[PDB]
Design an enzyme around this catalytic site. Structure first.
Site, mmCIF file in Angstrom:
data_model
loop_
_atom_site.group_PDB
_atom_site.id
_atom_site.type_symbol
_atom_site.label_atom_id
_atom_site.label_comp_id
_atom_site.label_asym_id
_atom_site.label_seq_id
_atom_site.Cartn_x
_atom_site.Cartn_y
_atom_site.Cartn_z
ATOM 1 N N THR A 73 0.858 -1.226 0.000
ATOM 2 C CA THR A 73 0.000 0.000 0.000
ATOM 3 C C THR A 73 0.870 1.244 0.000
ATOM 4 O OG1 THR A 73 -1.918 -1.023 1.075
ATOM 5 C CG2 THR A 73 -1.711 1.368 1.341
ATOM 6 N N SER A 74 0.489 2.208 -0.825
ATOM 7 C CA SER A 74 1.118 3.517 -0.850
ATOM 8 C C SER A 74 -0.020 4.509 -0.821
ATOM 9 C CB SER A 74 1.959 3.704 -2.117
ATOM 10 O OG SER A 74 2.892 2.650 -2.274
ATOM 11 N N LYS A 111 -8.966 2.676 -1.707
ATOM 12 C CA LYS A 111 -8.438 2.914 -0.363
ATOM 13 C C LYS A 111 -8.723 4.330 0.121
ATOM 14 C CE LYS A 111 -4.745 -0.287 -1.505
ATOM 15 N NZ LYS A 111 -3.350 -0.698 -1.207
#
Ligand SMILES: [Cl-]
Ligand SMILES: [Mg+2]
Ligand SMILES: [Mg+2]
Ligand SMILES: [Mg+2]
Ligand SMILES: [Mg+2]
Lengths: 250, 243, 196, 244, 231, 195, 226, 241, 204
Positions: free
Chosen positions: C1-2, C33
């Site tokens: 995840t970024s 997200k």
């Protein structure tokens, strides 16, 4: 901010009367007439939609309620008391039966559970009895078709045909003369409409009458296909148009 | 009859007589007022000097909630304290969850719902106080007054207690004569005058004046008591107006 | 995840990759997200997907009930509700949430809530496994009071690098722009951001 | 507070009587008569239905006679709904005993349990008592055939023959006159129906008005059979005994 | 009349009769006087015996090293309220290393008494208390009524015939407030005050009870031959 | 506790239970009676964890004695064994289970028959002609399988029991200090004082 | 287990294989993994089979009561919200992994939900030990604006990939099609590509082959009259 | 005569406490009206600020329950706010649990069931309020559902509540007898508000200024209340034809 | 240590033409030690038959539980419970102990009294229903039974042929399991007669 009513509000008077139950039955007597008739191949339950205003939409107020796919209920007396009893009856059919046995309860046992809830309001602390009499019509595989009355006391009786509320004494006499053990469902619906016309003052049509049946299985109302054993609900509420059709042959 | 013996019982009128009897205890209490000004609020109260043996400036009646809300009340003083204690719990839990200090309308409803709850059951007694309260939030100044029934509204000026009719009349003059508004320092002076004028209803015993205020310019939006030279200036102004 | 949130002149922009993994398998390659807790308060989610969804749903409930009673909540208030859940349930949660929102009074605000449940108000925030690789890039290239187009380019380039180096990150770069004008969704595909 | 509205269901009168118990007994005296008669080779339970209507579905109806287990049955007098609450408790107690000891519950133990529950409502809780009197008909291997009765006070007693509900004074005299110890089930059937036929407030005793049951140790190969009589079977036994 | 069956019921004029009946128990109780200067605070209490064989009921209770009270009314209620004060004084010391302010002790007693007046089943406390103390703002004297009302005073008296002592203190106000750094003269003024509330009986050695607290004086009670000096 | 044996013959049930009580290093006692009379015609022997064995036995004893007084009636051995089984079956899913194994030897006065029930700590009940707990069965069951007959007298049952104890004394590593033997029949319970 | 969901033009289709296994042993060769929550909300189940049946029936029951209370046909988002909040509370101990699909007055929907309470939105989804084999097929042949016939084909092909390549999956393909404005059509054993061949030999024994010690009639009837 | 003090049956089968709660309903001396358009539901209510010391912006009996649902109350303000806070909490909880916005009719039913409990359980008194819920429901369209102290509720084409409810009701009845439809056939909510105000003027026989009225409007995906200047624009349009 | 294989034992059920069969071994052990050769694992509640393998204390406990529940069912319903309904009761009851389960492998067998249809079902220890047309197996030699049944079984066997098939399936499976055997019982169930047969087998 306490509930201090841990004592019974219904008690025996010197004569042996349970006052609050008797007074609940008096409230039922003031209520609008509802009836039930049992045929060989079905049961019919009916009542008048006594509209409190013409601006009110009487379709939104359901006096005849589905409890399970094969069981229906109608009342006479206090409407709000009926509405919460229907909510509790629907839930108890699941919690104390369907979630255990994987099938809907038979009519007599669901009636027994409703009766129990009404009995408890007659003995528990800080509550009055329910001010309704219920008529519960239903079908199940092993008992067939049946019709039950349930009173504020928690007492219940099975009927071939009966009526409760305003004009019940006259209506029961009318049903005694007409009822026999060879009635088809259409004959019972016809008798139900004839009986109910006597206790109605004003307009008599599909919009002012509420009527439902417990009859044949309705696979068109099931909502899905592919499981042969699931054949659809036996409860069906008649439409405004379906009632008016039978009122021409009256 | 018998409808007035138990709290939460509707009379045939549709009235709750026990709440109306609590109002009588409020009417019996000392005079308290509230004035909404340009950027804040001013609270004032009449304290009856029952005896010479009372220590001056010590028996403080006005109470702070959080750091920005002032509360004053007339009637049964312990009931008022109990209500403020609840108010402080409500203001603490609001700030705990939402970070920002409780807005005044939000705070008003917290007291309102609590007071209203004490008219729902026979196992409790209604509050024997009318509470005048308010302060400065993000949307500006707010002044409220809350009755034993749980009823409250926002006010330009508010008054309760034995000298309420006298006070109300004086507050109505200020509203008419100052539509553009009143300054904080003016409201302190006028509050002193109104308590002095309202003291004719309690004229037998002499009294002690107590004033507080929240103002965006004068107190940084925090509740503070009026003390020393500013209090004496308001007493002198009030004493000049009665003579 | 970024994931990242960046304040700029007109407000704030939230950015995120779209990859969700169970071990080395990409369970979802088009994940969203960036989730809404109020009309103009959104968040970026990292950590346990069950936990961050459960938290966000509770926050959205709290701010809806807040709004019914007290009117529109501040971004600080939303961050506080997030913090309360994360801090008090720190033993049973794995959540790293960035809260971003737009007031008219306060303008664009960004709050980051790491594992412990602490709160940190920042001009911009980066989080998730892929953020490690862009601490250097983001510190050198961030400026305050950037335009909308500059901020979109800053997020696009940043997450492009985070995606390049982190196996846990990938897919599309989703963005959500929060200004006085309203709420704008943006999407950027691999063929666009990979060649940067 | 709430004290104002409390009837105080669990207090003594100045004479040392429990008000609510006495008034519950007055309620029960208006209920349809139930009779139990114990013989050497079985027990008879006969009971009169109260409400007569032609439209009542009799074959599916049950207001008087209930099954507690395979060996024990009860005849009810009073509030039917109150009785069903107690009946379900007794049914559970019987199965709890069977689970624990792997033996059918002895009749007295079941009777004592129910009677203790009734007693509780007269001594604590501030609730009204159950307006129910039971006749228990049962069999176990210790005492054989047993008849008991319990009332709202929680007192129970054992009987050779007994009535509850309406006209018990008249019914008990008639039973006391014609009962003998060496009597058989077929004779006891006839006595029960003759007694009801004389004490009834109705003009005539008919099948549609009666519930009837027998517990016999006259099952195939020394077992005990409970028989709840069907409407047609009640009609037959009325013709056999010469009442209709 | 119809509105005195319990504490939860207001009368039609807004009165709480059960609270007023609790207030009446205090008036029946034996007289006790409180007074202070800037340095010290004094309690003087007339103790009551059942008969000549019996002991004299104790009137003064110590709450901490810097605080204590005298009672008038139901003694078991004073025991409940003084035990509560002891705990709040103790909580302040243990948690905050801080002696409990006398004003704050009054606020706590007020709120404890209030809860009993608003709820069903309970009864008001049937006792009046005079709390003296020496804290960070000097000497203090409080008067507690079981309605909840707590009042900070220079001097006061509660109990039967207390009006006589209260009038004396109202006259003497300017004199006794100035008795600084002289505990014996302040007690003398308290003993002279309580003498205005006596009829038929006079102050004997096992009748009189005196307590004092001050600047360099822990709360200490004097009974028996320790008070013969002041008779 | 170590060895408990049971054998049901024609007209009685014989229970044999070891006398040793060992606490780790030392044998603290050599005359311990590992049994309780539950009713006049029902005896229960027990073996398992220290403390739990006696606590359980005496708890069962109290409950059966309470039942006897309430009903003025002795429960059948079957009924007693079912009650005991349920208590152990309840115990196994508790916070801290009773680690106790029992044999219940009783004479059913109604049926005029001896009855032996074997119940382990889990609540595993079996009715048997002969039974044991722990390692006792490993040594003795081959002898009982061989010699046992359902029509044996009490004296023949005791002789077969002596052979079982002798085999235990030969091949077991632990010194269990002999056995106390008790007989349950129509006349009640009695102890064989010389064995 | 292999389970899939595929969105199409006017609805959604789900599908599943029919193998239930204990370790390496096949317990049921024709297991039904497609469950009805309400008439038009169905889900495909993977994970612990008792947990999937229990959680579906509980939410299905509460959905039915909710439908009666509100006088409205149930929504997929309600089944999803109730499933996830229940599963989250039990912290993954209820091992239910579900693909939840349906039509309601809002439109057609397709979600997945995992045991820990995470949910997912998509046009095509797969779950179970055969999910990678299925997803390979879905990633190769899925497109936007699939017809009903194309979606059924794709879904059953994805299950077949699981049947043939995953040892945890086998036997038959069950399908359920939920189209807007129509009854949901449950297609039990839609494909049957694994019928066992005829055995080489009949193993029917001659009567009297087994040695018997005792015979007796078992009384299943109740205690008899007379 | 304690059968009049708590909620137990009188010998006539009546609940006097319920009946007296209905009387408390009219204690404010305020009349409300609700009507339905094509795309909207309008609710109007009288606004009376008798004291000059009151802040008139804080005097309101219309509540924003959720984004979609509005509620007008006929009855004392403390009971109104009790009902308002609860309805807000129930609407928020519903959305959290079931994943979609609570319908107007379902909220009405829930609040009616809560009111039913106060008529059966002795320790809780009925609230002395009539609650009129309004929305543009996503399934049923424009909706009016009203609840009372008896626990009764029903849907309405239009409705009126207060001391002079009968005069307003008959005025509305007569209009719908002419038009022969269940709503105000009008595109914009502005004109539906103008209809509502006009028909209240005719029924009550009184003229209104901007400060004498309070207006709530439900549209698709929001309910909002009109300001004094928004109402003034409405009053100008009425007077100009 | 493994609760499901301390005591040992097996159950198998099969369907035939207008009939069902259920069968079990008679061993109860304490691991290696054989304790009882008369521990029957098939019980019946009216015309519905329940086999239970696994931990023997739970076998006994569940039998006592379902007797309790089916007795109360019959008193309230005024009719004997059917196989389909009982199967749901078994499942519900097992799942209510989800996180502290009974260590058992139940098997239901019976004929529906109204439809005349043969019915069998099996469950894992937490209540997952396997409703097989053909056969159900359970216990410590379940693998062996799966092997026997899969080859020996053919559909629509007559009662006396089905007896031979199920008997040979059980016996030969039990002889390949240390913890099963010590005798066996076979119930042949028709709509209104049930025959019970004890089998002769090796006693090791
Ligand atoms: Cl509800
Ligand atoms: Mg990557
Ligand atoms: Mg009430
Ligand atoms: Mg073997
Ligand atoms: Mg061997």
């Amino acid at each position: 901010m306490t509930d201090r009513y841990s004592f019974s509000l219904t008690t025996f008077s010197p004569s042996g009367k349970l006052g609050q139950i008797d007074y609940a039955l008096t409230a039922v007597k003031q209520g609008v007439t509802s009836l039930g008739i049992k045929a060989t191949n079905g049961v019919v339950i009916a009542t008048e939609k006594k509209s409190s205003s013409p601006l009110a939409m009487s379709e939104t107020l359901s006096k005849v309620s589905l409890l399970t796919p094969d069981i229906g209920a109608v009342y006479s007396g206090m409407g709000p008391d009926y509405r919460v009893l229907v909510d509790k009856s629907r839930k108890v059919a699941h919690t104390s039966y369907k979630r255990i046995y994987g099938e809907y309860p038979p009519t007599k046992l669901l009636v027994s559970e409703v009766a129990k809830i009404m009995q408890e309001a007659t003995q528990s602390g800080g509550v009055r009895p329910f001010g309704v009499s219920l008529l519960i019509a239903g079908h199940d595989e092993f008992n067939g078709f049946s019709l039950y009355q349930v009173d504020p006391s928690g007492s219940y009786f099975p009927w071939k045909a009966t009526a409760i509320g305003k004009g019940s004494v006259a209506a029961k006499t009318f049903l005694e003369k007409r009822w026999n053990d060879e009635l088809e469902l259409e004959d019972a619906i016809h008798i139900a409409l004839l009986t109910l016309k006597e206790s109605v003052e004003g307009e008599f049509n599909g919009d002012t009458i509420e009527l439902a049946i417990i009859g044949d299985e309705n696979p068109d109302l099931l909502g899905y296909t592919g499981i042969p054993t699931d054949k659809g609900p036996r409860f069906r509420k008649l439409t405004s148009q379906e009632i008016n059709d039978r009122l021409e042959a009256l | 009859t018998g409808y007035d013996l138990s709290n939460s019982v509707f009379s045939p009128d549709g009235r709750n007589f026990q709440v109306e009897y609590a109002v009588k205890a409020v009417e019996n209490g000392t005079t308290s007022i509230g004035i909404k000004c340009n950027d804040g609020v001013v609270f004032a109260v009449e304290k009856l000097i029952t005896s010479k043996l009372l220590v001056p400036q010590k028996n403080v009646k006005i109470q702070v909630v959080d750091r920005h809300i002032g509360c004053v009340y007339s009637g049964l003083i312990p009931d008022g304290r109990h209500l403020v204690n609840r108010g402080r719990e409500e203001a603490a839990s609001f700030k705990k969850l939402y970070k920002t200090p409780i807005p005044i309308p939000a705070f008003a409803d917290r007291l309102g719902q609590y007071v209203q709850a004490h008219t729902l059951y026979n196992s409790v007694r209604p509050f024997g106080v009318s509470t005048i309260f308010g302060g400065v939030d993000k949307n500006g100044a707010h002044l409220y007054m809350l009755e034993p029934s749980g009823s409250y509204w926002g006010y330009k000026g508010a008054a309760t207690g034995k000298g309420r009719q006298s006070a109300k009349a004086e507050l109505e003059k200020l509203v008419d004569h100052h539509p553009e508004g009143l300054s904080a320092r003016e409201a302190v002076k006028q509050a002193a005058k109104i308590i002095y004028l309202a003291h004719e209803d309690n004229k037998e015993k002499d009294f002690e004046l107590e004033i507080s205020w929240c103002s965006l310019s004068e107190t940084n939006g925090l509740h503070k008591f009026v003390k020393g030279d500013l209090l004496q200036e308001a007493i002198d102004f009030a004493q000049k107006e009665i003579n | 995840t970024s994931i990242m949130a960046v304040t700029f002149k007109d407000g704030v922009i939230l950015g995120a990759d779209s990859r969700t993994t169970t071990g080395a398998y990409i369970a979802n390659r088009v994940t969203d997200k960036l989730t809404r807790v109020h009309d103009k308060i959104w968040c970026c989610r990292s950590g346990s997907a069950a936990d961050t969804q459960a938290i966000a749903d509770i926050v959205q409930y709290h701010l809806e009930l807040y709004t019914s009673q007290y009117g529109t909540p501040s971004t600080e208030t939303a961050a506080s509700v997030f913090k309360e859940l994360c801090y008090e349930n720190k033993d049973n949660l794995t959540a790293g949430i960035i809260v971003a929102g737009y007031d008219d009074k306060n303008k664009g605000e960004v709050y980051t809530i790491p594992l412990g449940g602490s709160v940190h108000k920042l001009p911009y925030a980066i989080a998730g496994s892929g953020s490690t690789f862009i601490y250097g890039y983001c510190d050198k290239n961030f400026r305050e009071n950037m335009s909308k187009e500059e901020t979109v380019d800053f997020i696009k380039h940043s997450l492009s690098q985070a995606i390049k180096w982190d196996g846990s990150s990938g897919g599309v770069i989703r963005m959500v722009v929060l200004t006085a004008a309203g709420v704008e969704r943006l999407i950027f595909y691999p063929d666009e951001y990979e060649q940067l | 507070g709430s004290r104002r509205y409390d009837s105080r269901t669990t207090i003594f009168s100045p004479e040392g009587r429990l008000y609510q118990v006495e008034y519950a007994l007055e309620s029960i005296s208006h209920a349809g008569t139930a009779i139990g008669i114990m013989a050497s080779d079985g027990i008879v339970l006969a009971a009169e239905r109260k409400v007569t209507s032609t439209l009542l579905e009799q074959d599916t109806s049950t207001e008087k006679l209930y099954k507690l287990n395979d060996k024990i049955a009860v005849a009810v007098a009073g509030l039917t709904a109150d009785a069903e609450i107690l009946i379900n408790t007794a049914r559970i107690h019987a199965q709890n005993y069977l689970k624990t000891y792997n033996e059918d519950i002895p009749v007295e133990i079941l009777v004592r349990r129910l009677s203790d529950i009734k007693q509780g409502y007269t001594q604590h809780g501030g609730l009204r008592p159950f307006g129910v009197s039971f006749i228990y008909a049962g069999y176990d291997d210790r005492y054989g055939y047993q008849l008991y009765t319990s009332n709202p006070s929680g007192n129970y007693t054992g009987w050779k023959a007994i009535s509850v509900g309406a006209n018990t004074s008249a019914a008990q005299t008639l039973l006391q006159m014609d009962y003998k110890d060496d009597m058989k089930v077929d004779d006891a059937i006839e006595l029960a129906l003759k007694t009801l036929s004389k004490t009834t407030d109705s003009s005539a005793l008919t099948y549609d008005r009666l519930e009837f049951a027998t517990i016999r140790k006259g099952a195939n190969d020394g077992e005990v059979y409970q028989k709840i009589f069907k409407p047609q079977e009640i009609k037959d036994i009325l013709v056999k005994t010469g009442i209709t | 009349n119809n509105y005195d069956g319990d504490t939860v019921t207001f009368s039609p004029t807004g009165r709480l009769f059960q609270v007023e009946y609790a207030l009446e128990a205090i008036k029946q109780g034996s007289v006790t006087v409180g007074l202070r200067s800037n340095t010290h605070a004094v309690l003087v209490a007339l103790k009551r015996n059942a008969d000549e064989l019996s002991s004299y009921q104790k009137k003064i209770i110590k709450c901490d090293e810097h605080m204590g009270l005298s009672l008038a009314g139901l003694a078991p209620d004073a025991r409940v309220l003084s035990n509560y004060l002891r705990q709040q004084c103790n909580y302040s010391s243990l948690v905050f290393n801080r002696k409990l302010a006398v004003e704050r002790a009054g606020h706590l007693l007020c709120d404890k008494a209030q809860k009993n007046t608003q709820s069903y089943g309970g009864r008001p406390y049937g006792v009046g208390l005079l709390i003296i103390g020496y804290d960070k703002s000097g000497a203090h004297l409080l008067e507690f009524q079981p309605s909840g009302n707590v009042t900070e005073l220079y001097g006061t008296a509660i109990g039967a015939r207390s009006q006589g002592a209260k009038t004396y203190l109202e006259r003497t106000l300017d004199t006794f407030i100035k008795i600084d750094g002289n505990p014996d003269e302040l007690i003398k003024a308290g003993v002279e005050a309580i003498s205005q509330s006596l009829r038929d009986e006079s102050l004997t050695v096992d009748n009189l009870s005196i307590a004092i607290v001050g600047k360099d004086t822990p709360f200490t009670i004097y009974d028996g031959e320790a008070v013969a000096k002041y008779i | 506790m170590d060895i408990i044996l049971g054998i049901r013959v024609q007209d009685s049930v014989i229970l044999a239970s070891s006398k040793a009580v060992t606490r780790g290093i030392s044998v603290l006692k050599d005359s311990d009676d590992k049994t309780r009379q539950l009713s006049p015609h029902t005896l229960m022997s027990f073996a398992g964890e220290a403390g739990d064995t006696v606590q359980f036995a005496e708890y069962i004893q109290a409950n059966i004695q309470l039942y006897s007084i309430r009903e003025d009636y002795e429960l059948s051995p079957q009924a007693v064994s079912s009650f005991v089984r349920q208590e152990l079956a309840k115990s196994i899913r508790s916070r801290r289970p009773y680690q106790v194994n029992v044999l219940i030897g009783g004479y059913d006065k109604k049926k005029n028959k001896p009855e032996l029930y074997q119940i382990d700590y889990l609540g595993t009940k079996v009715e048997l002609p002969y039974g044991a707990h722990g390692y006792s069965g490993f040594y003795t069951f081959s002898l009982l399988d061989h010699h046992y007959r359902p029509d044996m007298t009490t004296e023949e049952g005791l002789d077969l029991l002596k052979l079982c104890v002798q085999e235990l004394e030969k091949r077991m590593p632990m010194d269990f200090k002999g056995v106390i033997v008790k007989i349950v029949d129509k006349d009640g319970i009695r102890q064989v004082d010389d064995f | 287990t292999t389970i899939v969901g595929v969105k199409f033009n006017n609805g959604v289709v789900i599908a599943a294989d029919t193998r239930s296994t204990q370790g390496p042993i096949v317990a049921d060769k024709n297991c039904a993994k497609l469950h009805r929550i309400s008439p038009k909300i169905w889900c495909a189940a993977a994970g612990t089979a008792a947990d999937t049946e229990a959680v579906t029936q509980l939410i299905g029951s509460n959905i039915e009561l909710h439908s009666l209370y509100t006088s409205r046909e149930p929504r997929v988002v309600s089944a999803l919200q109730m499933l996830k909040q229940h599963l989250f509370k039990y912290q993954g101990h209820i091992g239910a992994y579900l693909i939840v699909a349906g039509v309601d007055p809002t439109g057609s929907h397709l979600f997945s939900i995992h045991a820990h309470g995470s949910t997912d939105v998509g046009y095509y989804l797969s779950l179970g030990s055969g999910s990678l084999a299925a997803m390979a097929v879905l990633e190769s042949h899925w497109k936007q604006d699939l017809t009903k016939e194309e979606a059924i084909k794709l879904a059953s092909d994805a299950i077949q990939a699981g049947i043939w390549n995953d040892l945890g999956s086998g036997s038959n393909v069950d399908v359920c099609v939920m189209e807007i404005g129509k009854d949901a059509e449950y297609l039990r054993n839609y494909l049957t590509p694994n019928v066992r061949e005829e055995k080489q030999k009949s193993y029917k024994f001659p009567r009297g082959t087994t040695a018997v010690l005792k015979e007796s009639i078992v009384n299943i009837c109740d205690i008899q009259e007379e | 005569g304690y059968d009049r003090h708590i909620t137990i049956f009188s010998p006539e089968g009546r609940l006097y406490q319920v009946e007296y709660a209905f009387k408390a309903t009219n204690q404010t001396n305020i009349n409300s009206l609700a009507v339905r358009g094509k795309d909207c539901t309008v609710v109007i209510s009288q606004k009376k600020v008798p004291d000059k010391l009151l802040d008139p912006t804080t005097v309101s009996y219309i509540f924003c329950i959720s984004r979609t649902i509005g509620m007008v109350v006929n009855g004392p303000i403390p009971d109104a706010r009790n009902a308002a806070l609860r309805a807000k909490a129930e609407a928020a909880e519903f959305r959290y649990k079931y994943g979609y916005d609570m319908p107007c009719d379902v909220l009405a039913k829930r609040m009616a069931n809560l009111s039913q409990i106060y008529t059966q359980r002795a320790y809780m008194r009925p609230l002395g309020v009539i609650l009129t819920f309004v929305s543009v429901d996503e399934e049923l369209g424009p909706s009016i559902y009203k609840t009372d102290p008896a626990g009764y509720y029903v849907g309405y084409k239009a409705t009126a509540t207060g001391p002079k409810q009968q005069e307003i009701t008959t005025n509305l009845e007569n209009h719908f007898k002419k038009s022969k439809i269940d709503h105000i056939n009008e595109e914009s909510w502005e004109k539906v508000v103008e209809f509502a105000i006009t028909h209240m003027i005719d029924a009550l026989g009184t003229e209104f200024s901007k400060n004498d009225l309070e207006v709530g409007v439900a549209t698709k995906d929001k309910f909002f209340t009109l300001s004094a200047e928004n109402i003034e624009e409405r009053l100008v349009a009425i007077a100009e034809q | 240590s493994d609760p499901s294989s301390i005591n040992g034992g097996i159950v198998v059920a099969m369907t035939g033409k207008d009939c069902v069969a259920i069968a079990c071994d008679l061993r109860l052990g304490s691991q290696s030690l054989g304790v009882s050769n008369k521990f029957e694992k098939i019980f019946h509640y009216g015309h519905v038959f329940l086999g239970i393998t696994g931990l023997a204390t739970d076998v006994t406990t569940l039998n006592e539980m379902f007797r309790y529940k089916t007795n109360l069912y019959k008193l309230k319903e005024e009719r004997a419970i059917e196989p389909e309904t009982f199967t749901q009761l078994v499942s519900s009851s097992l799942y209510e102990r989800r996180f502290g389960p009974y260590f058992v492998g139940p098997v239901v067998a019976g004929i529906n009294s109204k439809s005349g249809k043969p019915f069998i079902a099996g469950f894992d220890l937490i209540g997952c229903i396997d409703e097989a047309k053909d056969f159900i197996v359970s216990g410590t030699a379940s693998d062996q039974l799966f092997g026997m049944c899969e080859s020996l079984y053919e559909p629509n066997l007559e009662p006396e042929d089905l007896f031979e098939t199920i008997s040979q399936a059980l016996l030969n499976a039990a002889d390949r399991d240390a913890l099963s055997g010590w005798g066996a019982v076979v119930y042949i169930i028709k709509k209104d007669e049930v025959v019970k047969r004890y089998l002769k087998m090796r006693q090791d």
